[PDB]
Ligand binder design. Structure first.
Ligand code: F43
Ligand code: F43
Ligand SMILES: C[C@@H](OP(=O)(O)O)[C@H](NC(=O)CCCCCCS)C(=O)O
Ligand SMILES: C[C@@H](OP(=O)(O)O)[C@H](NC(=O)CCCCCCS)C(=O)O
Ligand SMILES: O=S(=O)(O)CCS
Ligand SMILES: [Cl-]
Ligand SMILES: [Cl-]
Ligand SMILES: [K+]
Ligand SMILES: [K+]
Ligand SMILES: [K+]
Ligand SMILES: [K+]
Ligand SMILES: [Mg+2]
Ligand SMILES: [Mg+2]
Ligand SMILES: [Mg+2]
Ligand SMILES: [Mg+2]
Ligand SMILES: [Mg+2]
Ligand SMILES: [Mg+2]
Ligand SMILES: [Mg+2]
Ligand SMILES: [Mg+2]
Ligand SMILES: [Mg+2]
Ligand SMILES: [Mg+2]
Ligand SMILES: [Mg+2]
Ligand SMILES: [Xe]
Ligand SMILES: [Xe]
Ligand SMILES: [Xe]
Ligand SMILES: [Xe]
Ligand SMILES: [Xe]
Ligand SMILES: [Xe]
Ligand SMILES: [Xe]
Ligand SMILES: [Xe]
Ligand SMILES: [Xe]
Lengths: 547, 441, 248, 442
């Protein structure tokens, strides 16, 4: 049966194929456990603060239809949509905090300064000593001066520094407590690729405290990291506490060998580094760790990336950073609930596998026309054959993103190239718009009408491989239902190929780390856990507040 | 506008032209300065080898970035001549304009000078990288008939992650100017030029590095409006005496103190020269201490600025290590104020720039070595042209004591921009122009 | 003009809706007061509020275009710009959102047409809007069960029908009368109660809906079966792609 | 000349001016009038002396609702504008015989200030006109009244605002049509960050002149952005000529044929008709009662299509006398023509894409606003490369007063000062004359 049949049956009384139902007799918001909780909370909140707040009698009465539960895809967890709002979901907030508070910093230039400029030796022994010093220092504790006041260790317990290197010998020489072991976290072929990319380089994965990231911003991360790297370099390598060479370490840590998660943004959407808009689609695919655990199922890997990106890009970034309010929980949920996108994408994978075999299709428009058209028609036909499914994903934009994501990912499965996958994404929108004489919301296909022409353009602010595109790509800077799906399409070809990474191997390795708070190997499982209020985030101030 | 005249000398201490009107050195009038500035606006270095290796390995879009399966094996350097010729045809406006495209390193790099005509109808300066980038992108695509499906990789190899990034992140082209969005303020573009870029193009010649830096800094002061009205003469006198070795003052001071001298001895000789030349006079006397006063602060500031330059050359010269220039910029000015009772260069702005410059070149918090600073850097933007030219002279005298030298940060600039004569030896071209217009002012 | 390709009934209906020389079938007669009441921008017999002075009371700048483009009556009068918005059920409503916008700008002057998945809107000068609204309400643009006039809370285009075949309406502006088989509009498009409801006629038969609908569906006419219509969309996709690269 | 196309040049009225002009006589790279307009835009500043005086009288400086009690200064700036303006001119100019212009307006209340070109020949960008003008007038005011060292900083705040604490000249009492370089969406966008309302203000709501100035500015930006280089250069020149310069009278004639009774659809049918007659398109093949059109010159089809798009905006929003529908016209003119012909729409769908989000961000809660506040540097309307914004300018020009944020609300200072420049007010007349005068030097 269709992978979404289970969710549809647990959502409505009727069989999924039925064309009629009954409305208006459900009791409005009283049908819902969550809306009832909200009504009582609003009553207590308004009374306590002396200002009216949540009131179900304001505006129009929710719940004239069924207020649906949602299955989180690849799970058996069913929750009301409010439980997948990022404000109500600590797992979603922690996912972004774990990215925002992460920076990658090389040690290669630094070690060259130590040996060439200072004339001291760097060894695995000194590196371990430095790493023990920096893990004391990074959460906010002192190593050089007298009478320093520091951060409470329990408030910053999630902050630390690890390293990785492609040289297995050097990796074995360093205390394993500080090492992300590439051999232990990746399958053999992927580990060999990643280690060859890194070579003899040594790279730090720095995570600053969630409590600081939440107090401040993403541009804080690389600065905070650089200060404590600098202080630990002074301490472990016995240089003067502030001499000329000290500046070389700061420049290298803040500019010369730093890798931000996101680049800064232009003025209209003014934002510093390490904000969602600066994270390119290729990075997001590599931050998601599905690739190293689900590598035998390219659909699962690709769609875990879609879920990662849909939540971050649509709910937190576009739905709050760039707007706010109720936001777009549903715009994103469509791409990771009820197993709907999974059904469409597994069909496309199967169709490509029967006709071409993964990655064996010609990388041209012929393949785009074939695969994207077939998968688009499959997806739209499900909405026609199942009325429940159409009522489930009631927003045209929701259906557009889900159908085109399957079409795009499928095309990339066939060609092994993300750019033809992107062409298939846009072809799906054109067919979709013509089949149903509708597509998405008022401004959903701005990028989609620019789409075809700009897929293969080479001009200044038009041409770019999809992996390098991101939320700041001009056409993409505004609208829901694309960015997270683009991260999936970026992952799509690499997952079919078995690639260990999409765009940056250092980013891939930097999140293969068991000391992260959010488990990036099972993004959708984590979302379900947050929805059930079973996720424990970092950064809480309970320790320093009254009972 | 002004009645001041100066004697112009060359980088070997020889008089070139006597009694030149001050405004003959003004960026607003001097044709050589115009030539250097427009050259700086329109010149681009294209790294054909880098583009080719990026495509070969699919390493595009920034540090440690790669798209497996996108690799393209194009012999770009092998066909550099045809590619460069095809690009020039697109870059140029007409066959007879001032477009220049010249291959370097056997085809590995290309020097590109976008025609001046494109900038007469442009708002700013980004046409140089952008017109060059698309021209070389299109020429490469046409040379090998790159397919619609693969061409976007040529674009990433040339211009990087732009426009997802605001910058040309991972690009294989270079300019001495940075993108306009990074200006600390409007009018700062000629200040956001790394000192290392200046030292690379002048190939470490100290006085040419000092001259080029002063030309750029003081020209920025005009675009920023600082050298307008009441302050115009102050900046021209500063350009002439600190950056143009007017009256051979910097050269003579360095001659008199180069063997055994220090910052303090340079100070004592400068105050002596100022007394002899009527720049300052004893205004009043305290107990065994004379307080100096002067009726032309602008000229005193200029004299003090020449002494500041010579002290950097004597102090950092003796060390052959640039780092101490931040110390010289500070205590030359600190000392001279309590030596004289008169304000230091730029009325304390140089000393302040030097305090933070010292801090941010010897601390954990930011900055770096002297070569990575510039007039647009938040650390070193505060003095209006009187500090950075000294840093340029210091990095020029460095003997390889810095990790982030021009070879580390400005290798492409060193190879390409040093090949343009006006950029390599600016002091010579500017003096000839001033003398040539001396009677048109 | 060809308007649209294809050999299905849908394609032809889409062509007919755009073709100004095609006479839309009049399926019901609506009074002018009922249109004003449905619109809800003013009371029947209430003066047209003005957003700016009349054009003849103003001295427009000498401008060859201004002199050659005759303004619509509402613009001459200085009327406000108001709207009428329709939701079209995906279960074979005669008009669909893209069909409307395309047809509006083929048929009507000075039209600001907006297309969305669950709503389609036109804004124009108030008095001109009322005559457009009369045609949009009286002709085959509209079915009282599969289409609804909705200024807000437009949810329903993608929902299952109720037992009567009516489209969902969070505010229930259009009430099906099971005793008479006809539909009445109890409230205005914004949801304000009407004093006297407006008869909207009998819903169309399932067979007539498929005769007139402009949506492709597997259980009607599938888009994938209109091969020539699909072929033109693919052609546009390919030509767009080649034009944006333009270095073959 | 690189290209072989020639065009017939027409005036705003619809009269032939010069026949068979090489296309590149209209190129920003060659046309002396465009060079003059672009350099003028770079160097012109409006100074609000009355505003400066009122700010000082009340200490209301540094941004909205900002005031420093106790800093008030009562200076009669408007009473002494001539002396102040003359003193400032002496600082702004390079020489007595250069092209500096300082002209008082409104009895001394405003001052048109045109900084000399010499200053920009040795400048990287354009910030010289606002910065040199600001300091010149600050110093002139201080010297006019011998304002003390202790109070002069208030004169600086009254003129240039909260800069440099703010990145912009927040609360400044000067104005330019260009915004600061840091606000560019990308390098080479400066000529695109000019509000449509600024263009409509400068052209005094002249439909064709507003279209021309906007097209001139947009397509010149395409050259600075490198978009109009190599394979794409001809496309952009033909777009400039036919959409913005009324080349061959195509825009004018299309509006004439549809102004009385016409719609977007009728304009489409006549444009498709004209293309066939001029050999721009031909029937490539036939389907069941459907004709697929092709073309051997996409750039020329696109230009013909760009002309019809402009004509449809003028017909549609003209009939309404309300600019808001231009977002609809930009969308469905292109949507309709593609399924009318089987050929790609203007800018290969880029105009349609811009219209989609433009419609959304001019009819929703999320941002944007009325058509007049958009521009080529706006994230909403930057995507089409010159073929959309000139239509928005034409639509706002036809607006009879339906917009709260009209040029009078957001560009009044521009409307008073920049419109006094003849080249900015009637660019089409100057560009056409310049094209004719270089017709045989190209
Ligand atoms: C290593 C530096 C160089 C640098 O760039 N910053 C340092 C160190 C840095 C570290 C020291 C943390 C640690 O001990 O691990 C921090 C806390 C910044 C950070 N990374 O979090 C800091 N200083 Ni410092 N630093 C301070 C200060 C100072 C004073 C201390 C003078 C004295 O006699 O004790 C002097 C500067 C001076 O002489 O004026 C100083 C210099 C120095 N400061 C010298 C180390 C001096 C030494 O060897 O002891 N700091 C202060 O003057 C008071 C505030 C204090 C800061 C912590 C706080 O604000 O609570 C701290 C601010
Ligand atoms: C008021 C707007 C105009 C606007 O700028 N945004 C709105 C409303 C805005 C509000 C609605 C909150 C509220 O009800 O108070 C929010 C939640 C954004 C916010 N401010 O937090 C939102 N929409 Ni809207 N909006 C949505 C959608 C939609 C779909 C709904 C179609 C349908 O048949 O129901 C349509 C566009 C379309 O037709 O394609 C739509 C339009 C509209 N959307 C129309 C209102 C339509 C109406 O009268 O009911 N949204 C969707 O398509 C699904 C996602 C959903 C968003 C909430 C979420 O993601 O969970 C919400 C996203
Ligand atoms: C100078 C500059 O550093 P960079 O030169 O850009 O590395 C700047 N830092 C600072 O100003 C550090 C300020 C806080 C630490 C010192 C306080 S005395 C910054 O991060 O942008
Ligand atoms: C357009 C622009 O708004 P302004 O026109 O600058 O107000 C921009 N907003 C957005 O892009 C909103 C994006 C998220 C809400 C809509 C999602 S479909 C921004 O705030 O910078
Ligand atoms: O109706 S609109 O498309 O503007 C809102 C979409 S969330
Ligand atoms: Cl002076
Ligand atoms: Cl004219
Ligand atoms: K409610
Ligand atoms: K300690
Ligand atoms: K925060
Ligand atoms: K076209
Ligand atoms: Mg039933
Ligand atoms: Mg079944
Ligand atoms: Mg902003
Ligand atoms: Mg088979
Ligand atoms: Mg020499
Ligand atoms: Mg002589
Ligand atoms: Mg001596
Ligand atoms: Mg080819
Ligand atoms: Mg030719
Ligand atoms: Mg006229
Ligand atoms: Mg006709
Ligand atoms: Xe994978
Ligand atoms: Xe480019
Ligand atoms: Xe240089
Ligand atoms: Xe001075
Ligand atoms: Xe070094
Ligand atoms: Xe200029
Ligand atoms: Xe100023
Ligand atoms: Xe083209
Ligand atoms: Xe209005």
């Amino acid at each position: 049966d269709k992978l979404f049949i289970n969710a549809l049956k647990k959502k409505f009384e009727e069989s999924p194929e039925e064309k009629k139902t009954t409305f208006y007799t459900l009791g409005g918001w009283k049908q819902s456990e969550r809306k009832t909780e909200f009504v009582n909370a609003g009553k207590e909140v308004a009374a306590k603060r002396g200002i009216p707040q949540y009131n179900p009698d304001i505006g129009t009465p929710l719940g004239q239809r069924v207020l649906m539960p949602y299955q989180v895809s690849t799970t058996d967890t069913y929750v009301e949509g409010d439980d997948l709002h990022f404000v109500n979901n600590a797992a979603m907030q922690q996912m972004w905090d774990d990215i925002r508070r992460t920076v990658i910093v090389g040690l290669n230039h630094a070690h060259a300064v130590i040996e060439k400029r200072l004339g001291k030796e760097v060894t695995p022994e000194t590196i371990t000593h430095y790493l023990e010093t920096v893990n004391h220092a990074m959460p906010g504790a002192a190593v050089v001066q007298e009478h320093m006041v520091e951060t409470h260790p329990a408030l910053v317990a999630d902050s630390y520094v690890k390293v990785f290197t492609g040289n297995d010998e050097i990796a074995d020489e360093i205390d394993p407590a500080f090492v992300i072991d590439i051999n232990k976290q990746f399958p053999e072929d992927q580990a060999e690729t990643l280690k060859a990319e890194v070579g003899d380089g040594i790279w730090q994965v720095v995570r600053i405290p969630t409590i600081v990231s939440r107090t401040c911003d993403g541009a804080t991360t690389s600065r905070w990291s650089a200060m404590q790297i600098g202080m630990s370099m002074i301490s472990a390598y016995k240089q003067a506490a502030g001499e000329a060479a000290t500046g070389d370490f700061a420049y290298a840590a803040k500019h010369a060998e730093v890798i931000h998660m996101g680049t800064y943004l232009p003025v209209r959407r003014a934002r510093g580094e390490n904000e969602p808009g600066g994270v390119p689609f290729g990075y997001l695919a590599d931050i998601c760790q599905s690739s190293r655990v689900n590598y035998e199922d390219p659909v699962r890997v690709s769609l875990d990336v879609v879920a990662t990106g849909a939540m971050l890009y649509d709910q937190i970034w576009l739905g709050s950073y760039m707007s706010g309010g109720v936001g777009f929980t549903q715009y994103a949920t469509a791409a990771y609930t009820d197993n709907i996108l999974d059904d469409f994408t597994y069909f496309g994978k199967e169709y490509v596998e029967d006709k071409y075999g993964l990655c064996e299709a010609p990388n041209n428009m012929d393949t785009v026309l074939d695969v994207a058209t077939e998968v688009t028609f499959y997806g739209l036909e499900q909405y026609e054959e199942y009325p429940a499914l159409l009522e489930d994903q009631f927003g045209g934009s929701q259906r557009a993103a889900v159908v085109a994501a399957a079409a795009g990912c499928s095309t990339a499965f066939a060609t092994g190239n993300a750019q033809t996958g992107l062409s298939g994404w846009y072809l799906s929108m054109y067919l979709h718009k013509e089949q149903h004489s509708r597509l998405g919301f008022y401004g959903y296909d701005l990028q989609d009408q620019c789409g075809a022409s700009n897929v293969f353009s080479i001009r200044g602010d038009e041409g770019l491989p999809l992996e390098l595109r991101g939320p700041n790509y001009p056409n993409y800077a505004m609208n829901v239902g694309h960015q997270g799906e683009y991260a999936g399409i970026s992952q799509a070809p690499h997952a079919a190929r078995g690639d260990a990474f999409v765009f940056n191997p250092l980013v891939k390795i930097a999140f293969a780390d068991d000391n992260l708070v959010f488990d990036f190997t099972n993004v959708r499982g984590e979302f379900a856990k947050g929805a059930l209020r079973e996720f424990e985030p970092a950064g809480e101030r309970a320790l320093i507040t009254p009972a | 506008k002004f009645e001041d005249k100066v004697d112009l000398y060359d980088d070997r201490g020889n008089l070139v032209e006597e009694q030149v009107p001050l405004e003959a050195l003004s960026p607003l009038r001097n044709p050589a300065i115009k030539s250097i500035v427009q050259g700086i606006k329109r010149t681009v270095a294209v790294n054909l080898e880098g583009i080719e290796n990026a495509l070969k390995t699919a390493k595009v879009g920034g540090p440690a970035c790669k798209i497996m399966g996108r690799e393209l094996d194009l012999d770009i350097v092998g066909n550099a001549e045809s590619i460069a010729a095809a690009a020039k045809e697109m870059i140029q406006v007409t066959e007879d304009d001032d477009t220049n495209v010249e291959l370097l390193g056997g085809g590995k790099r290309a020097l590109v000078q976008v025609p001046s005509a494109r900038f007469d109808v442009a708002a700013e300066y980004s046409a140089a990288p952008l017109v060059t980038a698309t021209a070389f992108v299109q020429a490469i695509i046409n040379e090998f008939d790159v397919s619609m499906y693969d061409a976007n990789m040529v674009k990433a190899a040339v211009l990087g992650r732009y426009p997802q990034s605001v910058e040309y992140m991972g690009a294989n082209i270079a300019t001495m100017l940075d993108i306009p969005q990074k200006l600390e303020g409007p009018g700062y573009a000629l200040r956001n030029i790394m000192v290392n870029h200046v030292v690379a193009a002048t190939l470490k010649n100290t006085l040419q590095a000092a001259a080029l830096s002063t030309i750029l800094e003081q020209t920025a002061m005009f675009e920023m409006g600082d050298a307008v009205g009441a302050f115009e003469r102050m900046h021209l006198l500063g350009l002439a005496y600190q950056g143009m070795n007017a009256d051979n003052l910097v050269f003579d001071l360095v001659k008199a103190n180069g063997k055994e001298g220090t910052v303090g001895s340079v100070i004592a000789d400068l105050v002596e020269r100022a007394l002899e030349d009527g720049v300052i006079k004893v205004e009043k006397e305290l107990t065994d201490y004379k307080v100096y006063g002067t009726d032309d602060l602008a000229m005193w500031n200029a004299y003090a600025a020449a002494g500041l330059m010579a002290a950097t050359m004597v102090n950092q010269g003796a060390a052959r290590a640039a780092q101490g220039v931040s110390s010289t910029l500070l205590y030359y000015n600190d000392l001279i104020e309590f030596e004289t009772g008169l304000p230091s260069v730029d009325f304390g702005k140089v000393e302040g720039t030097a305090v933070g410059f010292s801090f941010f070149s010897h601390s954990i918090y930011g900055g770096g070595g002297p070569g990575i600073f510039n007039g647009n850097h938040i650390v070193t933007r505060h003095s209006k042209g009187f500090a950075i030219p000294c840093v340029a002279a210091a990095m020029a005298l460095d003997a390889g004591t810095q990790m982030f030298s021009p070879e580390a940060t400005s290798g492409l600039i060193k190879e390409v921009f040093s090949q343009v004569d006006e950029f390599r030896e600016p002091l010579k071209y500017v003096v000839e122009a001033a003398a040539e217009i001396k009677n048109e002012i | 003009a060809q308007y649209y390709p294809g050999t299905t009934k849908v394609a032809q209906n889409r062509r007919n809706f755009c073709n100004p020389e095609y006479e839309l079938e009049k399926l019901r007669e609506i009074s002018d007061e009922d249109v004003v009441k449905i619109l809800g921008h003013r009371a029947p017999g209430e003066e047209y509020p003005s957003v700016h002075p009349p054009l003849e009371e103003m001295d427009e700048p000498e401008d060859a275009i201004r002199e050659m483009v005759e303004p619509i009556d509402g613009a001459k009068a200085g009327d406000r710009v108001r709207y009428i918005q329709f939701t079209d059920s995906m279960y074979f409503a005669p008009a669909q959102p893209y069909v409307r916008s395309r047809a509006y700008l083929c048929r009507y002057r000075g039209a600001d047409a907006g297309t969305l998945s669950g709503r389609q809107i036109i804004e124009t000068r108030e008095r001109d809007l009322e005559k457009i609204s009369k045609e949009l309400l009286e002709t085959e643009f509209f079915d009282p069960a599969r289409s609804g006039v909705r200024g807000k809370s437009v949810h329903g285009h993608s929902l299952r029908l109720d037992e009567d075949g009516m489209m969902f309406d969070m505010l229930r502006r259009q009430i099906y009368n099971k005793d008479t088989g006809r539909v009445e509009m109890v409230k205005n498009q914004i949801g304000d109660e009407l004093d006297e409801p407006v008869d909207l006629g009998e819903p169309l038969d399932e067979e007539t809906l498929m005769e007139k609908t402009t949506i492709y569906r597997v259980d009607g006419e599938a888009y994938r079966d209109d091969v020539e219509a699909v072929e033109i969309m693919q052609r546009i996709h390919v030509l767009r792609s080649q034009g944006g690269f333009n270095l073959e």
